Design a protein around this ligand. Structure first.
Ligand SMILES: O=C(NC/C=C/[C@H]1O[C@@H](n2ccc(=O)cc2)[C@H](O)[C@@H]1O)c1cc([N+](=O)[O-])cc(O)c1O
Ligand SMILES: [Mg+2]
Length: 213
């Protein structure tokens, strides 16, 4: 029994089926109170929401599904006919994400791709009927942000105005990617400061009074 299955089970037990907001709130409660997990969380999630609403993307690529928290967050804001594709190398995470989307009622909008991003990116156009991407959410292994961005470009998946949105650029950090994009005339960058997810960390003092030998 994994932490990820425990999160899904908590959602099935407590959230309202077909209600994406309820699903996000159930995840946030469980991870705030019971077990830390690497979901983007509601603080950064609000920022994501504002960006998605600004750009109204028709085709979004997510790198890194995990439990589906960000896939639920994004897909609930997509217009009719818009699509999210999400890449997940861990088959256990891919299954959880699909059940989460199902529970939320968002399964029609989202396609899960099982595999490593660097292996899947070159197959997008032919296998998933993609021309260029409107938005890319990066939230997978931090050392893959830069090489995958380069591969996206190589494969002709970026157009003028494609919006890349990257989590964790301060903590744990993505320093090669951040330096690259900030220094490149091919990208115009903006930083949105927020807070790392679920950081009310419990600790305590133990008093132990010696009673004699
Ligand atoms: O390490 C972090 N994220 C790595 C994410 C990894 C996810 O991306 C998938 N994937 C999908 C496709 C691939 O090709 C590779 C991996 C993995 O199978 C996992 O589901 C992280 C860590 C902290 N932290 O505070 O420690 C906070 C965060 O917000 C984080 O995102
Ligand atoms: Mg993250």
């Amino acid at each position: 029994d994994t932490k990820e299955q425990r999160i899904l089970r908590y959602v099935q037990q407590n959230a309202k089926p077909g209600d994406p907001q309820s699903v996000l709130e159930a995840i946030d409660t469980y991870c705030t109170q019971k077990e830390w997990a690497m979901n983007v969380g509601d603080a950064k999630g609000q920022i994501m929401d504002a960006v998605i609403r600004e750009y109204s993307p028709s085709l979004v690529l997510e790198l890194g599904a995990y439990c589906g928290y960000s896939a639920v967050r994004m897909a609930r804001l997509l217009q009719p006919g818009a699509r999210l594709l999400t890449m997940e190398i861990n088959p256990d995470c891919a299954a959880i994400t699909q059940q989460m989307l199902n529970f939320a009622g968002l399964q029609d909008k989202v396609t899960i791709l099982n595999g490593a991003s660097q292996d899947l990116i070159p197959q997008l156009k032919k296998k998933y009927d993609v021309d260029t991407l409107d938005m890319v959410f990066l939230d997978h292994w931090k050392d893959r942000y830069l090489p995958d961005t380069l591969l996206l470009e190589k494969c002709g998946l970026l157009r003028k105005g494609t919006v890349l949105l990257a989590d964790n650029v301060i903590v744990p950090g993505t320093p090669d990617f951040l330096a690259y994009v900030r220094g490149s005339s091919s990208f115009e960058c903006t930083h949105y400061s927020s807070y790392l997810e679920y950081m009310k960390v419990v600790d305590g003092l133990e008093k132990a009074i010696y009673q004699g030998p």
